[PDB]
Design a protein around this motif. Structure first.
Motif, PDB file in Angstrom:
ATOM      1  N   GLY A  17      -3.015  -0.504  19.271  1.00 56.15           N
ATOM      2  CA  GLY A  17      -3.480  -0.428  17.920  1.00 56.15           C
ATOM      3  C   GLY A  17      -2.333  -0.322  16.922  1.00 56.15           C
ATOM      4  N   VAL A  18      -2.636  -0.682  15.689  1.00 55.57           N
ATOM      5  CA  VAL A  18      -1.675  -0.561  14.577  1.00 55.57           C
ATOM      6  C   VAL A  18      -2.284   0.187  13.383  1.00 55.57           C
ATOM      7  N   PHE A  19      -1.473   1.004  12.727  1.00 56.31           N
ATOM      8  CA  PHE A  19      -1.897   1.629  11.468  1.00 56.31           C
ATOM      9  C   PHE A  19      -1.354   0.799  10.314  1.00 56.31           C
ATOM     10  N   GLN A  20      -2.245   0.174   9.539  1.00 55.39           N
ATOM     11  CA  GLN A  20      -1.888  -0.703   8.404  1.00 55.39           C
ATOM     12  C   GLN A  20      -2.789  -0.471   7.200  1.00 55.39           C
ATOM     13  N   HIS A  21      -2.225  -0.424   5.985  1.00 56.97           N
ATOM     14  CA  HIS A  21      -3.065  -0.381   4.787  1.00 56.97           C
ATOM     15  C   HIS A  21      -4.089   0.778   4.904  1.00 56.97           C
ATOM     16  N   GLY A  22      -3.637   1.961   5.345  1.00 62.62           N
ATOM     17  CA  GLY A  22      -4.469   3.159   5.450  1.00 62.62           C
ATOM     18  C   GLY A  22      -5.400   3.402   6.631  1.00 62.62           C
ATOM     19  N   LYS A  23      -5.478   2.457   7.564  1.00 61.73           N
ATOM     20  CA  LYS A  23      -6.451   2.538   8.656  1.00 61.73           C
ATOM     21  C   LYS A  23      -5.877   1.965   9.926  1.00 61.73           C
ATOM     22  N   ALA A 366      -5.567   4.851  22.057  1.00 63.83           N
ATOM     23  CA  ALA A 366      -4.677   3.977  21.312  1.00 63.83           C
ATOM     24  C   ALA A 366      -4.736   4.241  19.806  1.00 63.83           C
ATOM     25  N   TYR A 367      -5.938   4.496  19.302  1.00 63.33           N
ATOM     26  CA  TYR A 367      -6.173   4.765  17.885  1.00 63.33           C
ATOM     27  C   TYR A 367      -5.319   5.973  17.407  1.00 63.33           C
ATOM     28  N   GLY A 368      -5.408   7.058  18.144  1.00 59.35           N
ATOM     29  CA  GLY A 368      -4.653   8.251  17.856  1.00 59.35           C
ATOM     30  C   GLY A 368      -3.160   8.056  17.985  1.00 59.35           C
ATOM     31  N   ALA A 369      -2.741   7.310  18.998  1.00 60.35           N
ATOM     32  CA  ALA A 369      -1.336   6.930  19.152  1.00 60.35           C
ATOM     33  C   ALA A 369      -0.781   6.142  17.954  1.00 60.35           C
ATOM     34  N   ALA A 370      -1.581   5.211  17.420  1.00 57.94           N
ATOM     35  CA  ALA A 370      -1.210   4.418  16.265  1.00 57.94           C
ATOM     36  C   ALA A 370      -1.065   5.294  15.013  1.00 57.94           C
ATOM     37  N   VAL A 371      -1.978   6.256  14.850  1.00 54.00           N
ATOM     38  CA  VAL A 371      -1.876   7.252  13.771  1.00 54.00           C
ATOM     39  C   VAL A 371      -0.580   8.032  13.878  1.00 54.00           C
ATOM     40  N   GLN A 372      -0.287   8.535  15.071  1.00 52.54           N
ATOM     41  CA  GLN A 372       0.980   9.255  15.293  1.00 52.54           C
ATOM     42  C   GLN A 372       2.212   8.388  15.100  1.00 52.54           C
ATOM     43  N   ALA A 373       2.183   7.097  15.471  1.00 59.32           N
ATOM     44  CA  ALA A 373       3.330   6.247  15.221  1.00 59.32           C
ATOM     45  C   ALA A 373       3.628   6.098  13.709  1.00 59.32           C
ATOM     46  N   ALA A 374       2.556   5.986  12.916  1.00 55.48           N
ATOM     47  CA  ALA A 374       2.636   5.896  11.466  1.00 55.48           C
ATOM     48  C   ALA A 374       3.286   7.126  10.883  1.00 55.48           C
ATOM     49  N   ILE A 375       2.912   8.296  11.371  1.00 56.75           N
ATOM     50  CA  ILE A 375       3.410   9.553  10.809  1.00 56.75           C
ATOM     51  C   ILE A 375       4.904   9.624  11.064  1.00 56.75           C
ATOM     52  N   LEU A 376       5.300   9.264  12.279  1.00 57.73           N
ATOM     53  CA  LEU A 376       6.706   9.336  12.697  1.00 57.73           C
ATOM     54  C   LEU A 376       7.636   8.326  12.042  1.00 57.73           C
ATOM     55  N   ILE A 377       7.167   7.109  11.749  1.00 59.53           N
ATOM     56  CA  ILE A 377       8.021   6.172  11.019  1.00 59.53           C
ATOM     57  C   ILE A 377       7.966   6.418   9.514  1.00 59.53           C
ATOM     58  N   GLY A 378       6.976   7.173   9.055  1.00 56.17           N
ATOM     59  CA  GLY A 378       6.820   7.420   7.611  1.00 56.17           C
ATOM     60  C   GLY A 378       6.064   6.276   6.938  1.00 56.17           C
ATOM     61  N   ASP A 379       5.159   5.637   7.696  1.00 57.02           N
ATOM     62  CA  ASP A 379       4.189   4.661   7.173  1.00 57.02           C
ATOM     63  C   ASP A 379       2.891   5.371   6.734  1.00 57.02           C
ATOM     64  N   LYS A 380       2.845   6.691   6.945  1.00 54.74           N
ATOM     65  CA  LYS A 380       1.740   7.570   6.538  1.00 54.74           C
ATOM     66  C   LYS A 380       2.285   8.996   6.404  1.00 54.74           C
TER      67      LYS A 380
END
Length: 380
Positions: A17-23, A366-380
């Motif tokens: 999964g990917v976190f993009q544009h808030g979701k 996967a959904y939760g992993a994608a959320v965590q990846a966003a937090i760590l790169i600073g995309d969220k």
């Protein structure tokens, strides 16, 4: 560090999964499937990964690898390895005390470490994401079972490294499921994760406070899943065929395999309808097998297996020194948690409490992993 990517590297299926544009968006593969088999096949001319591997597994079983997750980061002489080997159709050997799978490939014998097999699966996951997004993917959060030790976690990270991913973090599968449901944002919260997939059953009790997760207990059954429920249906319907057409398919492995394929699909249908139709042309000696099976008979055939899933729940609670009333949230993970009877049994055990199930349970990790990846790169 690129787009924010999360990967559930599963024992028999994986999801990205990917976190993009808030979701979060879960990414379908080239066959349109939102999960991809954790399978790698070696043939006379090529290596096949994912659906292409699983599609030919019955034709090339000794050279088609799955369950590398059960080997990764372990030693060859480990009890679980020696036990698991007795039921795989491919050969496992030792090199420097580590397990390797042995296959024939381009007419020669080759061996691969579990991290190499898992890298091939991660490469497919990376490619699936790049097809969806455009460009290249650089980084990922990868998930592991809460019970994985440091060797297992490091070998999983090495799989990613070999693939060319910057592994931002290895996080626990139950933690990823909790993150997916925003449970860290929603004082101390006790959360039970009930994860019943195709081949493993894991119950985990976590505490979440001020955004920090602690695993309090784990329980389960490392060889229980959807495959077991399908086999109960196979036996039943094989007997029906014998009753109606006086032919015993038991000794014929192709006919049994075809009935199992049909039963697996019927089981999926029974999670949302009260009956399913089996339609097999020329099952045995030119005789077709067209029949129907009700949800009620499916539940009855699996009565022990379904009720039996409460025992690890009770054990996790005992080890966590929690009463069942002290669980604030229950989260469903794994395709088998779609089964209505399993939901009903769990809800009743918990005195009618509603379950967190609005995210496809095959996708929540996967959904939760994608959320965590966003937090760590600073995309969220």
């Amino acid at each position: 560090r690129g787009p924010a990517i999360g990967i559930d590297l599963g024992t028999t299926y994986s999801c990205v999964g990917v976190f993009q544009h808030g979701k979060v968006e879960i990414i379908a593969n080239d066959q349109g499937n939102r999960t991809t088999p954790s399978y790698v096949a070696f043939t006379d001319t090529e290596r096949l990964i994912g659906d292409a591997a699983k599609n030919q597994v019955a034709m090339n079983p000794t050279n088609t690898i799955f369950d590398a997750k059960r080997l990764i980061g372990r030693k060859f002489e480990d009890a679980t390895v020696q036990s698991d080997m007795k039921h795989w159709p491919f050969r496992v050997v030792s090199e420097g005390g580590k397990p390797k799978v042995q296959v024939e490939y381009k007419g020669e014998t080759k061996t691969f470490f579990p991290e190499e097999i898992s890298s091939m699966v991660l490469t497919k996951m990376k490619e699936i994401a790049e097809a969806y997004l455009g460009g290249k993917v650089h980084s990922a959060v990868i998930t592991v079972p809460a019970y994985f030790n440091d060797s297992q976690r490091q070998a999983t990270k090495d799989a990613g490294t070999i693939t060319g991913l910057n592994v931002l973090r290895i996080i626990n599968e139950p933690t990823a499921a909790a993150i997916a449901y925003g449970l860290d944002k929603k004082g101390e919260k006790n959360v039970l994760i009930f994860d019943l997939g195709g081949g493993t059953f894991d119950v985990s009790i976590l505490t979440i406070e001020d955004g920090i997760f602690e695993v309090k207990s784990t329980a389960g059954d490392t060889h229980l899943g959807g495959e077991d429920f399908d086999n109960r249906m196979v036996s039943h319907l094989a007997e029906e065929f014998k009753r109606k057409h006086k032919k015993d398919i038991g000794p014929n492995k192709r006919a049994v395999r075809r009935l199992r394929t049909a039963c697996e699909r019927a089981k999926r249908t029974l999670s949302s309808s009260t009956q399913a139709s089996i339609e097999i042309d020329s099952l045995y000696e030119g005789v077709d097998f067209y029949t129907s099976i009700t949800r009620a008979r499916f539940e009855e055939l699996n009565a022990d297996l379904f009720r039996g899933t409460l025992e690890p729940v009770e054990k996790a609670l005992r080890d966590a020194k929690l009463d069942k009333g002290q669980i604030q949230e229950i989260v469903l993970v794994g395709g088998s948690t779609r089964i209505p009877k399993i939901q009903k049994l769990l809800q009743d055990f918990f005195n009618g409490k509603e379950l967190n199930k609005s995210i496809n349970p095959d996708e929540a990790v996967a959904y939760g992993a994608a959320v965590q990846a966003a937090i760590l790169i600073g995309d969220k």
